[PDB]
Design an enzyme around this catalytic site. Structure first.
Site, PDB file in Angstrom:
ATOM      1  N   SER A  97      11.209 -10.748-117.456  1.00  0.00           N
ATOM      2  CA  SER A  97      11.990 -11.925-117.038  1.00  0.00           C
ATOM      3  C   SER A  97      11.797 -13.093-118.058  1.00  0.00           C
ATOM      4  O   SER A  97      11.194 -14.127-117.777  1.00  0.00           O
ATOM      5  CB  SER A  97      11.695 -12.304-115.583  1.00  0.00           C
ATOM      6  OG  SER A  97      10.315 -12.479-115.387  1.00  0.00           O
ATOM      7  N   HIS A 125      13.493  -5.215-111.968  1.00  0.00           N
ATOM      8  CA  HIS A 125      12.701  -3.940-112.043  1.00  0.00           C
ATOM      9  C   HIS A 125      11.227  -4.316-111.763  1.00  0.00           C
ATOM     10  O   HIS A 125      10.353  -4.162-112.647  1.00  0.00           O
ATOM     11  CB  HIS A 125      12.790  -3.324-113.469  1.00  0.00           C
ATOM     12  CG  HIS A 125      14.066  -3.644-114.205  1.00  0.00           C
ATOM     13  ND1 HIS A 125      15.271  -3.025-113.926  1.00  0.00           N
ATOM     14  CD2 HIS A 125      14.313  -4.499-115.232  1.00  0.00           C
ATOM     15  CE1 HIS A 125      16.205  -3.499-114.738  1.00  0.00           C
ATOM     16  NE2 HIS A 125      15.649  -4.394-115.540  1.00  0.00           N
ATOM     17  N   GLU A 152       6.828 -12.719-107.521  1.00  0.00           N
ATOM     18  CA  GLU A 152       5.373 -12.529-107.386  1.00  0.00           C
ATOM     19  C   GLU A 152       4.844 -13.224-106.155  1.00  0.00           C
ATOM     20  O   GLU A 152       5.121 -14.404-105.938  1.00  0.00           O
ATOM     21  CB  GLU A 152       4.619 -13.036-108.619  1.00  0.00           C
ATOM     22  CG  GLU A 152       5.208 -12.574-109.928  1.00  0.00           C
ATOM     23  CD  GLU A 152       4.471 -13.118-111.135  1.00  0.00           C
ATOM     24  OE1 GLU A 152       3.469 -13.899-110.986  1.00  0.00           O
ATOM     25  OE2 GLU A 152       4.941 -12.769-112.237  1.00  0.00           O
ATOM     26  N   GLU A 169       2.698  -5.064-112.666  1.00  0.00           N
ATOM     27  CA  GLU A 169       1.465  -5.823-112.743  1.00  0.00           C
ATOM     28  C   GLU A 169       0.365  -5.352-111.773  1.00  0.00           C
ATOM     29  O   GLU A 169      -0.642  -6.062-111.570  1.00  0.00           O
ATOM     30  CB  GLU A 169       1.751  -7.321-112.604  1.00  0.00           C
ATOM     31  CG  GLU A 169       2.705  -7.829-113.698  1.00  0.00           C
ATOM     32  CD  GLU A 169       2.901  -9.333-113.608  1.00  0.00           C
ATOM     33  OE1 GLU A 169       2.328  -9.950-112.692  1.00  0.00           O
ATOM     34  OE2 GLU A 169       3.629  -9.903-114.460  1.00  0.00           O
ATOM     35  N   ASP A 226       5.415 -16.809-107.637  1.00  0.00           N
ATOM     36  CA  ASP A 226       6.315 -16.938-108.782  1.00  0.00           C
ATOM     37  C   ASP A 226       7.689 -16.460-108.358  1.00  0.00           C
ATOM     38  O   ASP A 226       7.916 -15.259-108.178  1.00  0.00           O
ATOM     39  CB  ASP A 226       5.830 -16.185-110.030  1.00  0.00           C
ATOM     40  CG  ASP A 226       6.783 -16.388-111.240  1.00  0.00           C
ATOM     41  OD1 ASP A 226       7.785 -17.136-111.155  1.00  0.00           O
ATOM     42  OD2 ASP A 226       6.516 -15.810-112.302  1.00  0.00           O
ATOM     43  N   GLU A 253       5.622 -21.343-108.723  1.00  0.00           N
ATOM     44  CA  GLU A 253       6.141 -21.284-110.070  1.00  0.00           C
ATOM     45  C   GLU A 253       7.631 -20.922-110.144  1.00  0.00           C
ATOM     46  O   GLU A 253       8.105 -20.077-109.397  1.00  0.00           O
ATOM     47  CB  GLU A 253       5.321 -20.274-110.848  1.00  0.00           C
ATOM     48  CG  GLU A 253       5.755 -20.071-112.290  1.00  0.00           C
ATOM     49  CD  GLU A 253       5.159 -18.768-112.855  1.00  0.00           C
ATOM     50  OE1 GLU A 253       4.120 -18.300-112.358  1.00  0.00           O
ATOM     51  OE2 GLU A 253       5.787 -18.177-113.742  1.00  0.00           O
ATOM     52  N   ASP A 273       7.505 -22.256-115.893  1.00  0.00           N
ATOM     53  CA  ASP A 273       7.250 -21.084-116.745  1.00  0.00           C
ATOM     54  C   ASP A 273       8.456 -20.937-117.651  1.00  0.00           C
ATOM     55  O   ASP A 273       8.392 -21.337-118.820  1.00  0.00           O
ATOM     56  CB  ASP A 273       6.884 -19.841-115.904  1.00  0.00           C
ATOM     57  CG  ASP A 273       7.044 -18.538-116.683  1.00  0.00           C
ATOM     58  OD1 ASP A 273       6.810 -18.556-117.893  1.00  0.00           O
ATOM     59  OD2 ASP A 273       7.413 -17.515-116.065  1.00  0.00           O
ATOM     60  N   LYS A 327       1.819 -19.348-121.932  1.00  0.00           N
ATOM     61  CA  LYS A 327       2.090 -17.997-122.439  1.00  0.00           C
ATOM     62  C   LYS A 327       2.162 -18.104-123.956  1.00  0.00           C
ATOM     63  O   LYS A 327       3.150 -18.639-124.514  1.00  0.00           O
ATOM     64  CB  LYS A 327       3.409 -17.521-121.852  1.00  0.00           C
ATOM     65  CG  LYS A 327       3.247 -16.780-120.493  1.00  0.00           C
ATOM     66  CD  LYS A 327       4.648 -16.579-119.920  1.00  0.00           C
ATOM     67  CE  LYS A 327       4.549 -15.782-118.552  1.00  0.00           C
ATOM     68  NZ  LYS A 327       5.890 -15.769-117.854  1.00  0.00           N
ATOM     69  N   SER A 348      -1.565 -17.405-118.623  1.00  0.00           N
ATOM     70  CA  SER A 348      -0.849 -16.228-118.064  1.00  0.00           C
ATOM     71  C   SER A 348      -0.703 -15.032-119.023  1.00  0.00           C
ATOM     72  O   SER A 348      -0.469 -15.186-120.250  1.00  0.00           O
ATOM     73  CB  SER A 348       0.563 -16.672-117.597  1.00  0.00           C
ATOM     74  OG  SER A 348       1.330 -15.591-117.045  1.00  0.00           O
ATOM     75  N   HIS A 349      -0.744 -13.843-118.425  1.00  0.00           N
ATOM     76  CA  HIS A 349      -0.259 -12.604-119.060  1.00  0.00           C
ATOM     77  C   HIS A 349       1.283 -12.588-119.144  1.00  0.00           C
ATOM     78  O   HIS A 349       1.954 -13.547-118.691  1.00  0.00           O
ATOM     79  CB  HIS A 349      -0.757 -11.411-118.242  1.00  0.00           C
ATOM     80  CG  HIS A 349      -0.238 -11.393-116.819  1.00  0.00           C
ATOM     81  ND1 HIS A 349      -0.442 -10.322-115.969  1.00  0.00           N
ATOM     82  CD2 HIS A 349       0.495 -12.300-116.118  1.00  0.00           C
ATOM     83  CE1 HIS A 349       0.124 -10.585-114.797  1.00  0.00           C
ATOM     84  NE2 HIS A 349       0.695 -11.783-114.864  1.00  0.00           N
ATOM     85  N   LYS A 388      -3.477 -16.275-114.314  1.00  0.00           N
ATOM     86  CA  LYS A 388      -2.850 -15.135-113.644  1.00  0.00           C
ATOM     87  C   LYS A 388      -2.769 -14.001-114.662  1.00  0.00           C
ATOM     88  O   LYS A 388      -2.222 -14.142-115.768  1.00  0.00           O
ATOM     89  CB  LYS A 388      -1.522 -15.433-112.902  1.00  0.00           C
ATOM     90  CG  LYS A 388      -0.371 -15.885-113.708  1.00  0.00           C
ATOM     91  CD  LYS A 388       0.945 -15.852-112.839  1.00  0.00           C
ATOM     92  CE  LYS A 388       2.098 -15.503-113.790  1.00  0.00           C
ATOM     93  NZ  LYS A 388       3.437 -15.689-113.140  1.00  0.00           N
TER      94      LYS A 388
HETATM   95 ZN   LIG Z   1       9.508 -14.274-116.527  1.00  0.00          ZN
HETATM   96 ZN   LIG Z   2       6.862 -16.548-114.277  1.00  0.00          ZN
END
Ligand SMILES: [Zn+2]
Ligand SMILES: [Zn+2]
Ligand SMILES: [Zn+2]
Ligand SMILES: [Zn+2]
Ligand SMILES: [Zn+2]
Ligand SMILES: [Zn+2]
Lengths: 431, 431
Positions: free
Chosen positions: A42, A158, A167, A210, A245, A293, A320, A345, A372-373, A396
């Site tokens: 995303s 997906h 999330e 995840e 999220d 988020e 984000d 990120k 974040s990952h 996260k």
């Molecule tokens: Zn995203």
């Molecule tokens: Zn996000």
């Protein structure tokens, strides 16, 4: 010269979805320092360029041979013989080597691996761990172990289910150590598996990208009671909060200006932006929701500002896709009071120096920072060191499941052990 | 003395299912050498002892504090000041320190981490990569990159589905390099996701423990056409073979002497051992099935011998629970001609020296060796180096999905690059 960069080499490796990504090794007399680049699904429209090959005969066009060639033939030769300690200088050199605002010439995924690996080579030159070296670069006054925010139930682009928002996370905010935080997270995760199995059947407990569960749920409200039940069952009533999220851009239609909360189903569910705010205010009241988020589309600064105001002091609002770890977008968000937390990120911006600049700008204006990952991760653990180095108290990096998630959590265990019993844990505003 | 073991330390870390496991660091003047221990779910009755705490208040009794304490207080102090090059000597010392045939005093999960980390410290002392150092220990005449056998559709003990047999694997046996093997594997995996989505719905493409799909399938035959379709769709017709892991003990009932192929469903399906052989002969005829692991219960030596004879030269029969990487069980299997391939699992036996001895005994008696992960893995990549060091040409380390799987595959890329274009790839009998 003996202490400088001796070799730089990139290679295509696989991420946790089996898609190619870039890894870079910087070699000095101190060793081989290896960093790999994560990849979003995303991805915000304003993210730095992730350069892919587009060759249908390899990985249906997702190869990273060109980004790798850019490392091997352009960036690496420029770095040989350079002083790896000069992070800002070398990051700036790579910015200028690219010459474009979005890193679209060389690729953010060629540059970042270099930026990361330089900083690890430099840490080794100084004889300190990565987190210590990064804390010096960032001017961080106090290291801390972060509260981990575990994405344990999902509903986005997906995942394998109808769920539209991305999330549903649990965070052990009342843990008093990272060791305790991580154990409690795992215990709740295990309790949740059993709860999902009993309610939705044996077919419902396979995992998402995840490592969270993707049960056959369509409605965005339905995961929340289940989370509270798992927290209770695991014996941790009162120790946990929830983070969301929404990734709300992924549901949004520009021409209609409304959100589709079955975009993965045959029939559409059109919901407006204040129908959303209603939902968010209700969520924050009904559950211990401390963080939401991307509650709105990535250019809806007015929507963001509205919810940030309405939940001030109760629920941080995290940019984000809105902010894409980018000081220019962050300045727009500050000006509009659009949010009060940065989702950091490194690969949204593409250099360590710029990611640190983003963190510093956000903190100086009173925001929290959640390192974040990406949903596409690797065995790389850079963000474990980074979050401790920034002292932000929030990470996260997945459910406590799947090696590309647990590798970060485990690195946090190692850092916690090094720092000892007097090291600070958690996010003070949630403790 | 300056070159000897300086420090040994264990810690509890999380595996890819979020369960505690053991990691050990051996420190010498050359650095910190870190190894982590994997953990099975379908564990053979004859496996070396995996020592857990049984404390219901932590990880519902799955803690590894005792195994970690055994490393820190018993094994580590014994190793300090010792020559890490003396693999056999130090493994034997740890065997004697334990004093029991199954490593039930100290734990195979305390000992193994030490055995692994010693060998990495020794490799560094010699100034060679791990695979080179292990090849010297094993007397291996030719290194090779293995064919990866990817578990992409499943049906065993917790998977989230009705499917009773554990692993349906694809192997790019006609690839001419590991790079090509891995790409083809990923491409087929991606094609398979779409095929599963269209046939079983969006809810059907979440992943199992080893990163394969767990679609709502009950019957053991149903995955095979789907695998052939994915191979075709990805553009790799003819390049692939199939491997099975039946884990047939997990379905077997001792008092009835029959196999339950809905053990995860309300109603049972009782099938005999020759009803099985019928199925296996048919599988091997209908599809390019080159390997079937644990086709029968772990003490059914007669069943194993029957299928090994009936598929000789066409389909290797792999002992996993039958043999548990143990020279004593392997001798029984040789005597009875029960199988002709060893599934090599370092943590089924608990030392590197013993795992190497098992590989050497099997190869000397004409068996193949497939080095293997466990269903509970970590970011550890030891088995990538091990399989290359043994030159066996066969590895199973997961689908090309989930970091605890892709970390091994990626390490294989790194080894392949080091060895260059003249390095051997694959298993000659399948090429
Ligand atoms: Zn995203
Ligand atoms: Zn996000
Ligand atoms: Zn020097
Ligand atoms: Zn020395
Ligand atoms: Zn098993
Ligand atoms: Zn097996």
């Amino acid at each position: 010269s003996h202490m400088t960069i001796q070799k730089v080499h990139g290679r295509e490796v696989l991420d946790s979805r089996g898609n190619p990504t870039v890894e870079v090794e910087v070699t000095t007399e101190k060793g081989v320092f290896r960093s790999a680049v994560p990849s979003g699904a995303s991805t915000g429209v304003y993210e730095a360029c992730e350069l892919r090959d587009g060759d249908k005969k390899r990985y249906v066009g997702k190869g990273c041979l060109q980004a790798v060639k850019n490392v091997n033939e352009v960036i690496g030769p420029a770095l040989i013989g350079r002083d790896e300690l000069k992070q800002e200088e070398l990051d700036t050199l790579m910015l200028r080597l690219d010459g474009t605002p979005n890193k679209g010439k060389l690729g953010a995924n060629a540059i970042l691996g270099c930026s990361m690996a330089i900083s690890k080579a430099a840490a080794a030159a100084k004889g300190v761990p990565l987190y210590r070296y990064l804390a010096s670069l960032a001017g961080t006054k106090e290291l801390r172990l972060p509260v981990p925010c575990f994405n344990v139930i999902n509903g986005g682009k997906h995942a394998g289910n109808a769920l539209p928002f991305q999330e549903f996370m649990i965070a052990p905010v009342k843990a008093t150590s990272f060791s305790e935080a991580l154990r409690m997270g795992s215990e709740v995760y295990h309790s949740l598996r059993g709860i999902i199995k009993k309610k939705y059947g044996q077919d419902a407990v396979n995992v998402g990208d995840e490592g969270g569960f993707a049960p056959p749920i369509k409605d965005i409200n339905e995961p929340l009671p289940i989370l509270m039940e798992a927290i209770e069952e695991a014996g941790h009533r009162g120790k946990f909060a929830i983070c969301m999220d929404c990734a709300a851009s992924e549901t949004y239609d520009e021409k209609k200006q409304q959100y589709n909360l079955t975009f993965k189903s045959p029939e559409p569910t059109w919901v407006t932006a204040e129908q959303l705010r209603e939902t968010y205010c209700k969520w924050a009241h009904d559950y211990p929701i401390v963080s939401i988020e991307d509650p709105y589309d990535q250019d809806d600064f007015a929507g963001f500002a509205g919810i940030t105001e309405a939940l001030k002091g109760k629920t941080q609002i995290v940019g984000d896709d809105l902010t894409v770890t980018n000081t220019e977008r962050i300045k727009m968000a500050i000006e509009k009071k659009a949010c009060n937390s940065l989702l950091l990120k490194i690969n949204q911006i593409g250099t360590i120096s710029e990611a640190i600049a983003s963190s510093k700008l956000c903190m100086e204006n009173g925001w929290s920072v959640m390192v974040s990952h990406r949903s596409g991760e690797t065995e790389d653990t850079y963000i474990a060191d980074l979050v401790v180095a920034l002292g932000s108290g929030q990470i996260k990096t997945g459910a406590p499941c799947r090696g590309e998630r647990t590798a970060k959590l485990n690195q946090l265990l190692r850092i916690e052990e090094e720092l000892g019993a007097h090291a600070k844990f958690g996010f003070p505003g949630w403790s």
